[PDB]
Design an enzyme around this catalytic site. Structure first.
Site, PDB file in Angstrom:
ATOM      1  CG  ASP A 133      42.575  26.197  35.776  1.00  0.00           C
ATOM      2  OD1 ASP A 133      42.956  25.110  36.346  1.00  0.00           O
ATOM      3  OD2 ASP A 133      43.299  27.257  35.643  1.00  0.00           O
TER       4      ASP A 133
ATOM      5  CG  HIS B  54      42.662  28.044  32.265  1.00  0.00           C
ATOM      6  ND1 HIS B  54      43.058  26.789  31.772  1.00  0.00           N
ATOM      7  CD2 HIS B  54      41.312  28.112  32.097  1.00  0.00           C
ATOM      8  CE1 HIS B  54      41.991  26.155  31.304  1.00  0.00           C
ATOM      9  NE2 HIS B  54      40.927  26.956  31.461  1.00  0.00           N
TER      10      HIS B  54
ATOM     11  CD  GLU C  68      40.488  32.822  39.742  1.00  0.00           C
ATOM     12  OE1 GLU C  68      41.129  32.368  38.819  1.00  0.00           O
ATOM     13  OE2 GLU C  68      39.234  32.703  39.752  1.00  0.00           O
TER      14      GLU C  68
ATOM     15  CD  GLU D 245      43.065  39.963  34.502  1.00  0.00           C
ATOM     16  OE1 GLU D 245      43.534  38.828  34.426  1.00  0.00           O
ATOM     17  OE2 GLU D 245      41.834  40.005  35.007  1.00  0.00           O
TER      18      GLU D 245
HETATM   19  N1  LIG Z   1      37.309  46.432  40.933  1.00  0.00           N
HETATM   20  C1  LIG Z   1      36.470  45.285  40.766  1.00  0.00           C
HETATM   21  N2  LIG Z   1      35.339  45.239  41.440  1.00  0.00           N
HETATM   22  C2  LIG Z   1      34.535  44.220  41.334  1.00  0.00           C
HETATM   23  N3  LIG Z   1      34.802  43.211  40.557  1.00  0.00           N
HETATM   24  C3  LIG Z   1      35.930  43.186  39.842  1.00  0.00           C
HETATM   25  C4  LIG Z   1      36.807  44.221  39.924  1.00  0.00           C
HETATM   26  N4  LIG Z   1      37.842  43.923  39.104  1.00  0.00           N
HETATM   27  C5  LIG Z   1      37.617  42.740  38.534  1.00  0.00           C
HETATM   28  N5  LIG Z   1      36.439  42.282  38.975  1.00  0.00           N
HETATM   29  C6  LIG Z   1      35.816  41.041  38.627  1.00  0.00           C
HETATM   30  O1  LIG Z   1      36.485  40.101  39.135  1.00  0.00           O
HETATM   31  C7  LIG Z   1      36.351  38.931  38.201  1.00  0.00           C
HETATM   32  C8  LIG Z   1      37.626  38.369  37.982  1.00  0.00           C
HETATM   33  N6  LIG Z   1      37.641  36.880  38.068  1.00  0.00           N
HETATM   34  C9  LIG Z   1      39.050  36.366  38.129  1.00  0.00           C
HETATM   35  C10 LIG Z   1      39.800  36.370  36.752  1.00  0.00           C
HETATM   36  C11 LIG Z   1      41.157  35.620  36.863  1.00  0.00           C
HETATM   37  N7  LIG Z   1      42.066  36.065  35.806  1.00  0.00           N
HETATM   38  C12 LIG Z   1      42.928  35.104  35.103  1.00  0.00           C
HETATM   39  C13 LIG Z   1      42.864  33.754  35.456  1.00  0.00           C
HETATM   40  C14 LIG Z   1      43.694  32.863  34.778  1.00  0.00           C
HETATM   41  C15 LIG Z   1      44.534  33.363  33.786  1.00  0.00           C
HETATM   42  C16 LIG Z   1      44.534  34.730  33.491  1.00  0.00           C
HETATM   43  N8  LIG Z   1      43.744  35.551  34.162  1.00  0.00           N
HETATM   44  C17 LIG Z   1      37.073  36.480  39.407  1.00  0.00           C
HETATM   45  C18 LIG Z   1      36.850  34.941  39.421  1.00  0.00           C
HETATM   46  C19 LIG Z   1      35.570  34.573  40.193  1.00  0.00           C
HETATM   47  N9  LIG Z   1      35.922  34.107  41.500  1.00  0.00           N
HETATM   48  C20 LIG Z   1      34.918  33.488  39.392  1.00  0.00           C
HETATM   49  O2  LIG Z   1      34.906  32.335  39.830  1.00  0.00           O
HETATM   50  O3  LIG Z   1      34.411  33.732  38.295  1.00  0.00           O
HETATM   51  C21 LIG Z   1      35.772  39.533  36.883  1.00  0.00           C
HETATM   52  O4  LIG Z   1      34.352  39.053  36.793  1.00  0.00           O
HETATM   53  C22 LIG Z   1      35.910  40.766  37.015  1.00  0.00           C
HETATM   54  O5  LIG Z   1      34.947  41.566  36.270  1.00  0.00           O
END
Ligand SMILES: Nc1ncnc2c1ncn2[C@@H]1O[C@H](CN(CCCNc2ccccn2)CC[C@H](N)C(=O)O)[C@@H](O)[C@H]1O
Ligand SMILES: Nc1ncnc2c1ncn2[C@@H]1O[C@H](CN(CCCNc2ccccn2)CC[C@H](N)C(=O)O)[C@@H](O)[C@H]1O
Lengths: 342, 342
Positions: free
Chosen positions: A31, A280, A123, A132
């Site tokens: 994206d 996305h 993010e 989420e």
């Molecule tokens: N409590 C928590 N403690 C620690 N970590 C946590 C907790 N909760 C979630 N996580 C992590 O946060 C990550 C989520 N991603 C973002 C997902 C975005 N979602 C979308 C996007 C578009 C459409 C639909 N949905 C981060 C991106 C990151 N900057 C990168 O570039 O990859 C994932 O790895 C998760 O496991």
């Protein structure tokens, strides 16, 4: 912890397993609007990172921490709860940034950090912004934020607008009408038609659309992340009063969101609006089980109520009414089970 | 029970949640090969059901119990563990069969039946036959079977054949080569390329294919459901020696299955083979990590070993070798997380 206190374990297992896969990470990094916009917001506001201490909440592959290092951060703590943390550590070593980026495995609600931070980056936006329930982790991480610290993103604007889309409505309605069959292989299924229609109409529809289907200017609802507490996101009430610009059938409400990175040099916006290049996050429409007729100049008023659930999502209530006729519509939607029409 | 001891609870939650949706039931009912074949096998063998006691294991919407009712069953016990049972009960009432069909909610390993049955019916087949581990529930239900009682389906044949598909093989490296970049927005991703490749090769590929890619006749592995114990399915060892019908590079093994309803009047076959109309089981392909060259008339020999896990699925271990040249290949795949390519 607060995480396991608001999360069914089976939901958390599926969630973190899903984000442990490199293919998912590859999908998100492609994206280009999202990744390029994050990089632009961080690098063009380099003064907010120069020799500062930063926390990256849910760093995934670690990309935002690399951006923060490129902009001059002295130290970045990158917190990640999935097995993606291991891959993030690999990249930190192969890019010679072990003196700058410290990966901390675990949930941001459960880990211990050695110091307070100047700025939080993340993010945390899901579909419709709030799906989420990661915004609550992001706000929880403010316990590590120094007074007068910043947040990236800084604010979120949700936009809602009524739309007309007969083709979408009929697609979902005709799918449900399979259960109107009195002799499917000799069996009468019709007693379940009402159940089936409920099931299909609770699914928010994730896809994009032409802005010509909108029947009114959007209403905006703002969450300021510098000021919100986690508990503010348990129950989100969005009143709305639309002034109808076109006559026709309102088949539901459309949702999108913008976030703003309010930096010392400039403010950078990341928008998922249908007038902007596609991301996305697409857009999300909630269908009414019975559409409402409206005339141009009428007012469509009501409430969109989001109730957080333990599957990391929200139960959505939309109650809406055409004031001039008293036509009313009530809908319940399950954000955890979206229909990806893309 | 036997079910909870072989099944992680988190996996069972997701599994039963999935089957609770009317849309899944609808998707399965619209597979005309599946539904029409089950109806035909039950109706054409009416003397196996007329005034008989039947058990329906995992009844879902109830459709096979209605088939058994059409054929004259005196009493049909329909056991179902998801919330679909509640919809099944509604259908039993609206079709005026409350006196003949008794819906029992819960797992077949945990519920109590009031009497022994003359015949057991079910649809326990997942992808590659064994996925989801429902065959073991099927076999467990033989505790309720009278001596000389029948099973519908009666037998299962898994087929294995070697295939060539150069585009599929290359797709995996093309996907993984997204990581082979020294400056993705400033970041060198290349150290993760190997991990991405490994990740894609652990995924069996669920889709269909032209039969021209098969390079030998299938080897067949038969489970006789009248005579199998549950423990026969914990470790499934499928030796093979393929006699190559075409020369070329072997990229992996292709899997499908047939089941047979062996009744007193006739035997009816339901086939998921690539030579037959397509069903919602499609076919499954597992790639070797390295292709093997083989000439027509050579023998490719080895073993496919399926090891049951607690995620309701199997770890798949494939070893193969060209006997005439000594060329060897293996793979290890996780059947719970397939790649839906169709
Ligand atoms: N409590 C928590 N403690 C620690 N970590 C946590 C907790 N909760 C979630 N996580 C992590 O946060 C990550 C989520 N991603 C973002 C997902 C975005 N979602 C979308 C996007 C578009 C459409 C639909 N949905 C981060 C991106 C990151 N900057 C990168 O570039 O990859 C994932 O790895 C998760 O496991
Ligand atoms: N231990 C258990 N105790 C009680 N109930 C159990 C147990 N285990 C599973 N169940 C139920 O068995 C049902 C499974 N379905 C078959 C779905 C599988 N088909 C495919 C097709 C392609 C790919 C994958 N799968 C039966 C359909 C039924 N004949 C009907 O007519 O709907 C589901 O409702 C399950 O919850």
């Amino acid at each position: 912890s607060v995480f396991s206190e608001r999360t069914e374990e089976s939901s958390a297992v599926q969630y973190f397993q899903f984000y442990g896969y490199l293919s998912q990470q590859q999908n998100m990094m492609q994206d280009y609007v999202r990744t390029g916009t994050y990089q632009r917001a961080i690098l063009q506001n380099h003064t907010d990172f120069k020799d500062k201490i930063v926390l990256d909440v849910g760093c995934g592959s670690g990309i935002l921490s690399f951006f923060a290092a490129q902009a001059g951060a002295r130290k970045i703590y990158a917190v990640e709860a999935s097995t993606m943390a291991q891959h993030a550590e690999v990249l930190v070593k192969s890019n010679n940034l072990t003196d700058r980026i410290v990966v901390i495995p675990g949930k941001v609600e459960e880990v211990s950090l050695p110091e307070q931070v100047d700025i939080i980056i993340s993010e945390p936006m899901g579909y419709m912004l709030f799906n989420e329930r990661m915004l609550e982790s992001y706000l929880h991480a403010k316990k590590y934020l120094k007074p007068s610290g910043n947040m990236f993103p800084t604010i979120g604007d949700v936009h809602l607008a009524p739309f007309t889309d007969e083709q979408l409505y009929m697609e979902q309605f005709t799918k449900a009408n399979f259960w109107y069959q009195p002799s499917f292989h000799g069996v009468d299924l019709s007693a379940l038609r009402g159940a089936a229609v409920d099931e299909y109409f609770r699914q928010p529809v994730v896809d994009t659309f032409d802005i010509r289907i909108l029947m009114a200017k959007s209403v905006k609802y703002t969450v300021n992340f510098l000021e919100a507490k986690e508990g503010d996101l348990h129950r989100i009430e969005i009143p709305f009063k639309f002034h109808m610009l076109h006559s026709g059938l309102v088949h539901g409400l459309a949702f999108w969101f913008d976030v703003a990175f309010i930096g010392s040099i400039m403010t950078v916006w990341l928008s998922t609006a249908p007038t902007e290049p596609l991301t996305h996050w697409y857009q999300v429409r909630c269908l009414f089980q019975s559409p409402l007729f409206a005339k141009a100049g009428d007012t469509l008023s009501g409430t969109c109520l989001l109730i957080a659930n333990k599957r990391q999502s929200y139960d959505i209530s939309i109650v809406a009414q055409v004031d001039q006729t008293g036509s009313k519509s009530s809908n319940l939607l399950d954000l955890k089970n979206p229909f990806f029409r893309y």
